[PDB]
Scaffold this active site. Sequence first.
Site, PDB file in Angstrom:
ATOM      1  N   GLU A   1      -0.796  -0.321  -4.895  1.00  0.00           N
ATOM      2  CA  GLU A   1      -1.947   0.576  -4.934  1.00  0.00           C
ATOM      3  C   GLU A   1      -1.902   1.408  -6.212  1.00  0.00           C
ATOM      4  OE1 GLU A   1      -1.599   3.980  -2.197  1.00  0.00           O
ATOM      5  OE2 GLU A   1      -3.790   3.977  -1.893  1.00  0.00           O
TER       6      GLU A   1
ATOM      7  N   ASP B   1       0.864  -1.173   0.000  1.00  0.00           N
ATOM      8  CA  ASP B   1       0.000   0.000   0.000  1.00  0.00           C
ATOM      9  C   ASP B   1       0.891   1.209   0.000  1.00  0.00           C
ATOM     10  OD1 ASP B   1      -2.564   1.295   0.097  1.00  0.00           O
ATOM     11  OD2 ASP B   1      -2.446   1.538   2.276  1.00  0.00           O
TER      12      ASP B   1
ATOM     13  N   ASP C   1      -8.023   1.614  31.631  1.00  0.00           N
ATOM     14  CA  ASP C   1      -7.495   0.306  31.990  1.00  0.00           C
ATOM     15  C   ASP C   1      -8.028  -0.056  33.366  1.00  0.00           C
ATOM     16  OD1 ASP C   1      -6.035  -2.062  31.847  1.00  0.00           O
ATOM     17  OD2 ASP C   1      -4.134  -1.120  31.461  1.00  0.00           O
TER      18      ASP C   1
HETATM   19 CA   LIG Z   1      -3.971  -3.451  30.886  1.00  0.00          CA
END
Ligand SMILES: [Ca+2]
EC number: 3.2.1.97
Length: 1336
Positions: A667, A635, A1282
């Site tokens: 591409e 690409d 998280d």
């Molecule tokens: Ca984590």
Amino acid sequence: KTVTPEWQTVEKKEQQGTVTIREEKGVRYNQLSSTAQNDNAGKPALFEKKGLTVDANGNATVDLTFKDDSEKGKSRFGVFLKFKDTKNNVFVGYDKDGWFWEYKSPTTSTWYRGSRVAAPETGSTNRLSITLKSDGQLNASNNDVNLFDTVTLPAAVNDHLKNEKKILLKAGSYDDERTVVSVKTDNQEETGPEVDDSKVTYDTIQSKVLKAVIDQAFPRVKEYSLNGHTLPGQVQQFNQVFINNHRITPEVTYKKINETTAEYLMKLRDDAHLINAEMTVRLQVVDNQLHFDVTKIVNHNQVTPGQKIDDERKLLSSISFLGNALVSVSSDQTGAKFDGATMSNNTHVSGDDHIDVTNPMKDLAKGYMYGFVSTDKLAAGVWSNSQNSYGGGSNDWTRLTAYKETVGNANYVGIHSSEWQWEKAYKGIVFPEYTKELPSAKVVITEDANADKKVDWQDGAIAYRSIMNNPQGWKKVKDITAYRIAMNFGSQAQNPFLMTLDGIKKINLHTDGLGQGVLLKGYGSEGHDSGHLNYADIGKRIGGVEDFKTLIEKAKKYGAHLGIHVNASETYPESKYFNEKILRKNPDGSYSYGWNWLDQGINIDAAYDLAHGRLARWEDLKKKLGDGLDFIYVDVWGNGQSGDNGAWATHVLAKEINKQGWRFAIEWGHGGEYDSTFHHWAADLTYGGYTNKGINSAITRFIRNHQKDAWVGDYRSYGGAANYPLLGGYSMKDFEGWQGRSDYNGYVTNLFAHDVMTKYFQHFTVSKWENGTPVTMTDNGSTYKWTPEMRVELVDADNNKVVVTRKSNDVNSPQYRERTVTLNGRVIQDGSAYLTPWNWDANGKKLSTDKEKMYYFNTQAGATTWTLPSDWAKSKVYLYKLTDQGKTEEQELTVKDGKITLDLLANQPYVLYRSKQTNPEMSWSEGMHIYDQGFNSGTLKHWTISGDASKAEIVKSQGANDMLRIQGNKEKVSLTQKLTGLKPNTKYAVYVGVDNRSNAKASITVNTGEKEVTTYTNKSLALNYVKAYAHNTRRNNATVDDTSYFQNMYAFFTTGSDVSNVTLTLSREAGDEATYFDEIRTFENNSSMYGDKHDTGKGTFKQDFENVAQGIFPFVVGGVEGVEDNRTHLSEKHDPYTQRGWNGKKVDDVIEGNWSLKTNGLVSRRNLVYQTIPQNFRFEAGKTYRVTFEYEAGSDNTYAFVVGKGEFQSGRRGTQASNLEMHELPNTWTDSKKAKKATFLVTGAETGDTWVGIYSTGNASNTRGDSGGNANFRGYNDFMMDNLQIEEITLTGKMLTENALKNYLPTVAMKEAVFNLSQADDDISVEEARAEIAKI
Ligand SMILES: [Ca+2]
Ligand SMILES: [Ca+2]
Ligand code: NA
């Protein structure tokens, strides 16, 4: 006489300049001028041309010749594309200080810094090309000089200008200074030194058939002679070469090795330019070919690949025999003619030159890709492995150079090999050995080779195939009929590897074994545009290496060839090979940032990369995957992001890829002409507009049509070559995710409409090409003349003969767009219908007699009659309708003196066979532990149904995508299968995708034999916004009623030691409305979220994001950017680059472990970034939970934690943004070294309906004086999560006042009410608590 301007000023009174028609020299113009009452800001002189407007598909093209008539250094000229107004547009143009781009919009307005190409000189003539696409990919060139590196408009900027169709020329004023430019209108209605051979000692080398007279002093051919006829080589002596671009007269010693072969040792010495080498050239005749070969090079300077060198001048970098024609033709000879091909991707402009060698005649010194010279008696063609380039566009790939040379009374046109390359280096470091390829050229000489009793370039072309290079893997192209992209993105695992096998099986049935090409875009890392450069990092969430290997092996059986999408121009910090040394920097030492999407990438120096072990990376991929893979799609390569992506650099890349056994695809359509077998620009017709398509050259396509998909296909809009090319040309679509497209019917229809015939012709080589009368067309803002092809003949190793003929030369006639094809005199296509033999299996092997077949397809209704060939004529004949279940509706046809009549459904494929046939067992979903995972087998027989079996059935989505539906059941209905091929004592996950329109319970249940886990949903309340996913909420993919609420419903479990009786059960309780299911996926998973255990069950919920099966569970992406390649995903740790501090980065990508949940740049959107849904986590009616997580945020109050219920913004009372409980989160770096922590108490609404998520507020971010990529990279606009924890608790008033205290303290550090909160009675009621907290 013309009184009609092609240009006119716009209607806004103050943005008006003066248009005027001016005819000067040969050419007519329209002179556009600015006035006193104009400026260069809000009120410049704007001009406008009828037709010139962004095309149907959202691409803006401008291809304008002009000259600047302004006083020197006084001009301010350019083109506006997608123009809304003076402060809302894209612009390309110049001023005093040169060429620049500029864009303006509320969000972002900047222009081009970095060195500009100089402005045009007064009166000089300028060929301007500008392209803006739907991607927002802006390129421009002036007289084939790239004006700047490709720029891509940001999402925000592009989305705002997406609909604007205006294309304007601007001419601005400043004080007394005016812009005046003259645009070229569409409508516009010999002696030379004599030779002296007296001192030359010649010699002859000869085969049976070809004789060449050669000089003993220097490797040059005086003439060729085949069967008594002659063609000159280089008549005038020229005993000079150019080494490192310096003229050098070599010391040559000669020696004839044998009757066919002569060789020359050539010493080369020039102290002033540090040249001191010798080379051996060898001239050899083989059959009718002359081989020119530099067989050995020796550089007496000390040079060592890999080692650095003190002076690049000591390298032997380029060798040029320019000035010695390898073959030529004299104007004295009858039929003297030269014909050449140059690169053109403009459907209006052919790239071919056809020149009569005459005296007098026009000058000629030009680079060409393919070149031929011919008399009445002989044609010759020249090949070279030179990767010379004279520039971009038509000057590129110019491996040959053709020159006019006047000798005595004669004009010669000769074809020379362009310059060759050898020892090269980057910043002192010499490139690896394999970059060096010994120079080589060939000439072929031929009499008539297509039996039309005349000798021209076509005869050269036919002969040329035996000396030319061939793209590795080219033989497979013929038989790859169905190309397709299978896409993965953003940790979502939209198209798992084994699941792709089901789609291969599906197409196998619908096409009756035609060959396939599936390109895996997002095979690695988290998906597409993730972990670039680490090619060996096969993605785990879609099945890892194990599954990718299975997919390759089992795909062979169906003629399914696989490729992977890679990038050698850019990388993201997450990647393993990401590292400062490999990064590309601008002159000023700042980084060359690539594009900002999931993360902000940085370009890499491809030259450095080559010089520092890029090959190792391919070899790792090879070691990891093993044999099997067909091709690599590179690409981006070509856009100059990573620096030089020229002929030479591209050849080297291709050799690295080829050497692993892989085919090359790119591409770019300009790109990789020497090695590529597939160009996206060529294949995807609706993309880039008329100036970005395939190779517009009859010569080139004549020569190589059978080896690659690189041509101009049928796209009426684009006109020229694109108006119904007789050889057709690959037109691509897809249904497995690419560009939000997942419609299956239109994929197959297109396949038969355009690709079957295109591929048929590729089973033959072209042998004759006949053109017609020039014709006038008008499109894409111009009126231009075009000579169409009228008749093409192709040929076969077994003397079969195909003849394609256009049914009218008249462009106004509909039969202009129609053809007849005859195979060996017999008609197989006429107009809208064809009946083609197809005598090859999926892999292109000859089908056995009993399996030979014909396909019938007709884009209109109506009877058609067809003459059968002799071996079908006296036979029985059976017609089958091809559907997604294979051959159906068997029907014996009536043959009547060798003819059959087909009156069938328009746009529906049928296959004919000489004897009765049956469909085979596909073994659906094999390896996935369940049969027919996606409901493609036309039957539910494999499921144990319990309940009213009439209430379950397979139905098609609005996208022709099969699903299980249960509805109108007054009692529970359930379907059960046993899970196959599981591993004992192993942790697993299973999801079914479910979209439930009923309030009734829709559930998935696993029973291991030892335990039973269940998960369920009531009415679904989250629309699906994953662009690459099959069941997103776009119309063309919607489940029903133009909506899709599909989200994966999970159950986690563990097998015991006995796997023989594990069952899965989908079930629905009583309800009227429908539940839809699709795609049951079962796979190993090592999460433990439920009271620190894996199996679905009770206990505190925890997500550390370290073992996510797929997606962003328990969240699902929200509507913040509509259906999109969502910019929220699982981010991966690669310290230091992804963490605080590197390149000034303000927040961590990963808070703890190796994974976190990152949102990138979605600030100021006023919408939901993601949310839980009850089936992933249910906040039960009346119960209170403590939601807790750690987070990074680079700006104050850009993201907020929200508690909601029901379907967000569904038009039902209280589902609106205002009515969410909202907690804006502060930034986490100005006063902290780590992620901050958040705590919330959430009580489940009695409708069982509640969810939590993150919302993008309307507040602006604060980028602290940064901008551009710096701004993006550093996370001002980012948000990370998280260590999610949700835990049920007993709600008490005190509990509330405590949590409130914690949540109000951060405000207090920059009172009395809050102190009083902290000493609230241990037994405050929930009412009094809320009372007091409300008052704070
Ligand atoms: Ca984590
Ligand atoms: Ca001929
Ligand atoms: Na990432």
